[PDB]
């Protein structure tokens, strides 16, 4: 396989789990810098799994 499959399934987990996190930073409506710094962490966490 060109790009490993097992890791590509993990990307779907992060893709929709991060969407749930946003719905909490609308009710507590954090300054974007706070909501961005957590969405940025899931990028590093996922790219390590690859």
């Amino acid at each position: 396989t060109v790009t490993n499959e097992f890791a590509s399934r993990f990307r779907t987990i992060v893709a929709t789990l991060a969407n749930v996190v946003n719905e909490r930073a609308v009710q507590d409506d954090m300054q974007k810098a706070t909501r961005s710094c957590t969405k940025q962490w899931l990028r590093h966490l996922e790219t390590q799994f690859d």
Partner: peptide, 11 residues
């Protein structure tokens, strides 16, 4: 295929 299942649509 679990790759083409999630990306294109249904979910």
């Amino acid at each position: 295929s679990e790759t083409d299942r999630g990306h294109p649509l249904f979910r």
